[PDB]
Amino acid sequence: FFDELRIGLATADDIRNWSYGEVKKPETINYRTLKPEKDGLFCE
Amino acid sequence: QDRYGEYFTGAMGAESIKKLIENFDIDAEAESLREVIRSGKGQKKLRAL
Amino acid sequence: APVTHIWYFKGVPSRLGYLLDLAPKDLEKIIYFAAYVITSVDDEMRHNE
Amino acid sequence: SADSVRAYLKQIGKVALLNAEEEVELAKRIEAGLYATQKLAELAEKGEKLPVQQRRDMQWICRDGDRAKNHLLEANLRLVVSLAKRYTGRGMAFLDLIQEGNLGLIRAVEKFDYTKGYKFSTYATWWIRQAITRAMADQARTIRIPVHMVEVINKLGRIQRELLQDLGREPTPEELAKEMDITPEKVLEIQQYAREPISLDQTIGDEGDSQLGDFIEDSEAVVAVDAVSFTLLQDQLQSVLETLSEREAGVVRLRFGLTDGQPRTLDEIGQVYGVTRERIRQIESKTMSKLRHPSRSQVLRDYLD
Amino acid sequence: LYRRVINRNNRLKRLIDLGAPEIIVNNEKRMLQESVDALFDNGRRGRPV
Amino acid sequence: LTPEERLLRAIFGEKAREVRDTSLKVPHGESGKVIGIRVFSREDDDELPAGVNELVRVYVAQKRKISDGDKLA
Amino acid sequence: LRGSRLGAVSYETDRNHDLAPRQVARYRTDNGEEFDVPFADDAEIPGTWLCRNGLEGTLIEGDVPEPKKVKPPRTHWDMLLERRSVEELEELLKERLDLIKA
DNA sequence: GCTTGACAAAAGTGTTAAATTGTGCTATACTGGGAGCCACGGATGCG
DNA sequence: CGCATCCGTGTAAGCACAATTTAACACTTTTGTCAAGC
């Protein structure tokens, strides 16, 4: 249950813990199939 | 650097700031600031606070 | 390469500047590779030679 | 001023631009140092040794070649800016163009040949232009288009401009197909591939408060009335008709995978028991005939659009 | 704004790999800093992208 | 298709067509008599937008009487 | 205006009392961090996997190492050898050595 | 009610051709951008 | 120690070759289907 809200300071470890996978490429989607490109933005 | 390189370490950019933070200690600054605050007859009182 | 968070660099006043005892327009130059800065100096070496 | 372009422009001038009789020694030393490294590698591989004087000389020339390469790069950094300044306005940052031209300059230095007698300025220009063009093709659009398709788009655009200037009026898809030796549908496809997206952050409504994304429907939203009714199907079609038929519908649960999720072929549901393929083939038709009866058929009419 | 951060971050990794002289590497680091600053607060320092 | 939908299709004598219905329909609260229709076709050299094959416009005319809530002045 | 998320949304009921069997495999990365991945009972577990930390890790079981058949990347030495031969550069190295002595 | 065997149609394996994408090369000389059509509060030197 | 003024701030590729992905074709296995009989 909600009791209080805390706003700390985020370090590299916190960001890596939140992260599910590193973005390696600026790709967003395929220009022809329009599917998201792997290892980039919008990566499934 | 080429005359006295081993006497010191220098850098620039965010890397130097990161290193300064690693080798920096917070306690001494707080103690010095408190001392200046309790002895700040001049303008340094406001800056120290 | 390490990068500093802009909010704390020039937070009006510079939080990082106050913490590191670097005045405005001097910490700025270090961040943007406009000047060098000494991270550490070895006093032990100079005593020997 | 805080402009980073100015900081780079007022920095590359620390090294004076070279001349024909000053740059040759740079490539000479670069090659000498690289082959000094090769001789050292051979020495390590073959277990050879050299006099300390020769070893020191070889290492010193290796360092001298590294220094000469660095000096040549710093001296020619100005050419990179002088060449990349032209590509402004395409849609890429000026400094990124400068740095990609610097990569091209590094490649040119790696592949320069003084023995041909030509000047470095002539040879490095091609590499710098190639690097800038590669950078523009690879990373100038939010949706990346391969290099060959980018070249096709550029050719189509140039031909379109030429035809428009010649005829004044706008061209037609048939004219583009005739000129480019491709079908008009292919011309339309290229035009679509060259179409750039817009940003949802743009203001809308003739006032600065609203944003474009405010008035976009969610076509994939889960309509409640359907979402509920589907579950009601799991109560009716999935359940009651099965209770009144026993295994005549129990096999159907395996047929379409109502249990465990797998629709299964006749053999798979038959081979595990003592019923043959043809018998299940008959049973399926019998069940279909049974459920076609008006008493059962009328109930489910409303669950099919 | 995200792509800007990625592209440069990749290019730096090439420049360090190729062992370019410190001028280009420093310029790349400065642009990376500027790109991160624009990503967080566009226009807080210099002209906005 | 979900297995229940396939079963329901098997119960009846219908099959799923490859097409979605996106027909034009009268907006909510609107009614009247159709008084005119105008059609433009790409097949007839009409000045249609790019990628548009056909355009249809329908005019609906309704006679409104004075009723509660209407504003007079 | 209406649009699409380049995807589809359904309403099939979610369940947890009947699920596939999982044989979790743990991969260790070079930096020392370990990550677990649940794979189906079909096995065919890859020898290496791309973990959350952005770099590839090897299966902890200690099997299926790579032979490193990948073709070595080109470098400055290759670009240098094509434009000039060994003898011409042996002569150059001898010339440079002579100047140092002088 | 259930099984056997021949038959037609649909679903797999594998080879091959083709379209689609990624990387490298071009040697007269060319070497330092060009855009551009404000008021308020907090601080420091001076009297 | 207070006030006047300065500063920070919210106009110019195209080709070649190699590598990957996708389709077209051919045959083979599997599935559903039909009749007839056990």
Side-chain angles (χ1 to χ4, degrees), chain D residues 225-241:
Chain D
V225 72
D226 293 336
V228 172
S229 173
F230 178 80
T231 60
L232 297 175
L233 190 72
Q234 306 309 76
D235 298 343
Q236 183 54 0
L237 188 153
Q238 185 147 320
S239 178
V240 308
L241 275 73

Side-chain angles (χ1 to χ4, degrees), chain B:
Chain B
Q1 187 62 37
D2 68 3
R3 288 180 196 250
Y4 319 121
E6 294 168 336
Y7 281 89
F8 72 103
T9 302
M12 64 184 289
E15 183 48 289
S16 73
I17 308 285
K18 178 165 166 57
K19 179 63 67 64
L20 288 178
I21 303 165
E22 321 316 329
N23 70 12
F24 165 76
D25 58 276
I26 192 77
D27 289 342
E29 281 292 294
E31 307 310 314
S32 186
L33 285 170
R34 204 164 297 100
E35 171 65 15
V36 172
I37 285 156
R38 86 175 167 202
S39 179
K41 301 193 288 196
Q43 175 68 288
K44 264 143 61 153
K45 184 171 179 280
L46 281 74
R47 192 180 297 260
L49 189 54

Side-chain angles (χ1 to χ4, degrees), chain D residues 86 130 155 158 161 255 265-266 278 281:
Chain D
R86 313 171 82 275
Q130 196 67 61
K155 169 169 281 200
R158 193 197 55 210
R161 302 202 283 231
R255 180 56 161 158
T265 185
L266 302 166
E278 171 59 15
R281 146 69 182 71

Side-chain angles (χ1 to χ4, degrees), chain D residues 101-258:
Chain D
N102 284 339
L103 271 296
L105 175 73
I106 287 167
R107 175 53 65 92
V109 171
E110 292 214 31
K111 195 173 211 253
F112 180 60
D113 194 10
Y114 66 85
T115 299
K116 295 186 190 286
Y118 269 125
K119 294 282 281 163
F120 186 88
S121 169
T122 298
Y123 181 61
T125 291
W126 293 97
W127 276 116
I128 289 161
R129 280 165 55 185
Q130 196 67 61
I132 284 163
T133 54
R134 271 285 183 280
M136 268 293 303
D138 273 356
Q139 65 183 357
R141 303 165 136 95
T142 301
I143 296 170
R144 184 183 68 89
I145 299 176
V147 191
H148 75 84
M149 251 305 308
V150 169
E151 292 163 13
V152 173
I153 289 167
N154 296 358
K155 169 169 281 200
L156 190 149
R158 193 197 55 210
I159 301 299
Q160 179 203 7
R161 302 202 283 231
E162 281 216 300
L163 259 63
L164 182 135
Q165 184 62 255
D166 179 62
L167 259 62
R169 53 183 290 280
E170 272 288 332
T172 76
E174 277 189 350
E175 211 76 60
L176 268 296
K178 197 76 55 164
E179 271 294 310
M180 291 265 278
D181 291 327
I182 72 184
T183 62
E185 287 78 347
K186 202 73 177 181
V187 179
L188 269 70
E189 283 177 36
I190 298 304
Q191 291 183 339
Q192 299 331 287
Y193 294 132
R195 185 179 67 189
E196 195 71 330
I198 57 165
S199 291
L200 293 157
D201 298 303
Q202 283 284 20
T203 49
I204 194 62
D206 304 343
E207 60 179 305
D209 182 272
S210 65
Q211 293 161 90
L212 190 150
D214 177 15
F215 311 109
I216 309 177
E217 315 199 292
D218 194 16
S219 309
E220 292 81 3
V222 298
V223 186
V225 72
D226 293 336
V228 172
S229 173
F230 178 80
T231 60
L232 297 175
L233 190 72
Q234 306 309 76
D235 298 343
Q236 183 54 0
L237 188 153
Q238 185 147 320
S239 178
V240 308
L241 275 73
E242 189 274 332
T243 68
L244 61 83
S245 81
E246 199 45 38
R247 248 63 185 190
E248 195 159 40
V251 75
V252 178
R253 300 198 158 207
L254 311 183
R255 180 56 161 158
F256 294 150
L258 276 297

Side-chain angles (χ1 to χ4, degrees), chain F residues 40-42 46 48-55:
Chain F
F40 317 89
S41 65
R42 181 158 292 285
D46 289 315
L48 272 52
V52 174
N53 293 77
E54 188 162 12
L55 201 43

